[PDB]
Amino acid sequence: GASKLRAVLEKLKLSRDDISTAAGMVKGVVDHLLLRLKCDSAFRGVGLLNTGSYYEHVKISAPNEFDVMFKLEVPRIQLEEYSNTRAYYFVKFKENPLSQFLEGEILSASKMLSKFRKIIKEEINDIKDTDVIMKRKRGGSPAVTLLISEKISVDITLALESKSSWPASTQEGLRIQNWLSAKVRKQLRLKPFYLVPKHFQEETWRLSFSHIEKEILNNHGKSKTCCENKEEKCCRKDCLKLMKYLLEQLKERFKDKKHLDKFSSYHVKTAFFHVCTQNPQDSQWDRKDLGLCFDNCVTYFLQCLRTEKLENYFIPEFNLFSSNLIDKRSKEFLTKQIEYERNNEFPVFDEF
Ligand SMILES: Cn1cc(-c2cccc(CNC(=O)c3cc(Br)ccc3O)c2)cn1
Numbered sequence: 001g002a003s004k005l006r007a008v009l010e011k012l013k014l015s016r017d018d019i020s021t022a023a024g025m026v027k028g029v030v031d032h033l034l035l036r037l038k039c040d041s042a043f044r045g046v047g048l049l050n051t052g053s054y055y056e057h058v059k060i061s062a063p064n065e066f067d068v069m070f071k072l073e074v075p076r077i078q079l080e081e082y083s084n085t086r087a088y089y090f091v092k093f094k095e096n097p098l099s100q101f102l103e104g105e106i107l108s109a110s111k112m113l114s115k116f117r118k119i120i121k122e123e124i125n126d127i128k129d130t131d132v133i134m135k136r137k138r139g140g141s142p143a144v145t146l147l148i149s150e151k152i153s154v155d156i157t158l159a160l161e162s163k164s165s166w167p168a169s170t171q172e173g174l175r176i177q178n179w180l181s182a183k184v185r186k187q188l189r190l191k192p193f194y195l196v197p198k199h200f201q202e203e204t205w206r207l208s209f210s211h212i213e214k215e216i217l218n219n220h221g222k223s224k225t226c227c228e229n230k231e232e233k234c235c236r237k238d239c240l241k242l243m244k245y246l247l248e249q250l251k252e253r254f255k256d257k258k259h260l261d262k263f264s265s266y267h268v269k270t271a272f273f274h275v276c277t278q279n280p281q282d283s284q285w286d287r288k289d290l291g292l293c294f295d296n297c298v299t300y301f302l303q304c305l306r307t308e309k310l311e312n313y314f315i316p317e318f319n320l321f322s323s324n325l326i327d328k329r330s331k332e333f334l335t336k337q338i339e340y341e342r343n344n345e346f347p348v349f350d351e352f
């Protein structure tokens with residue numbers, strides 16, 4: 001019962017891997033921004049999260065949409081959790097580079113994005129290469145969106161980097177011990193964490209774990225040799241892709257109505273990792289069973305909607321589906337749309 005899903009996955013692979021000029025234009029724009037931000041007072045230590053990560057695609061069906069993160073190290077941060085939210089923080093700290101954005105003791109996000117935008121917006125017109133336009137949008141995080149020629153779109157996010165221990169709200173998160181092992185959990189928690197602005201009180205930051213995500217997905221098996229042959233070839237990644245593509249196509253289909261705007265691939269990745277924890281054996285992700293495995297994910301995700309519970313994978317107490325974050329009517333609307341796709345072997349896939 002995998003025939004149609006395979007074809008979808010094959011189609012999606014061929015537009016990933018198709019020779020494109022997009023990545024090359026993105027790199028020239030980002031490198032110019034970085035060299036101009038580096039010789040500025042507040043952004044001296046700015047750098048790319050990964051080198052060779054100019055081509056990060058949040059939208060797995062939109063290959064001209066890139067999402068790039070610019071990191072910045074903040075030594076000796078003092079975090080203060082906002083209003084018991086477990087996940088949103090004030091940043092405090094004595095003539096650090098970021099002192100020009102203080103508000104008493106508290107790091108201002110909107111001020112830092114103000115100058116970040118203005119610095120970039122200044123270097124954008126200084127670009128003599130190609131057609132680069134930026135655009136003020138109310139999202140605000142993804143902060144600065146650039147458009148390169150017509151099709152290519154780049155979202156640039158600014159993150160603070162901390163090489164200290166992860167904040168306490170994550171202590172019981174990342175419950176990978178029965179799947180990736182307790183020792184990998186240690187190694188991962190020894191990596192730095194990142195803060196991005198919220199998009200409430202205005203100057204809060206939340207944690208970003210996109211780098212931990214990338215790391216799990218590139219080494220995702222209980223078996224160390226998972227996906228290194230076709231001997232133990234598994235379908236975890238393919239299931240994540242179909243979850244992502246399912247929500248994207250639904251968001252696209254119902255973009256006129258307003259009900260799916262609060263959902264993102266972040267809700268889908270989060271539910272997916274919970275199912276990995278629930279099903280830690282590679283045998284439970286055999287590629288022969290692509291159709292069943294996908295169904296597990298779809299089923300679990302729909303359970304989350306109906307109960308209004310989807311705990312953050314890194315922060316156990318933070319409920320992404322709390323009605324204060326996404327109300328009952330929206331979750332009930334997504335629920336019924338997916339139940340319909342599923343009960344009809346997903347017609348949103350045979351259409352592009
Ligand atoms: C798009 N969007 C995200 C948040 C958000 C809010 C509050 C706290 C967090 C913590 N991050 C994660 O759970 C996370 C999980 C995975 Br899988 C990969 C990366 C991640 O950053 C995120 C809000 N909108």
Ligand SMILES: [Zn+2]
Nearest residue numbers: 221226227234
């Ligand atoms: Zn695998």
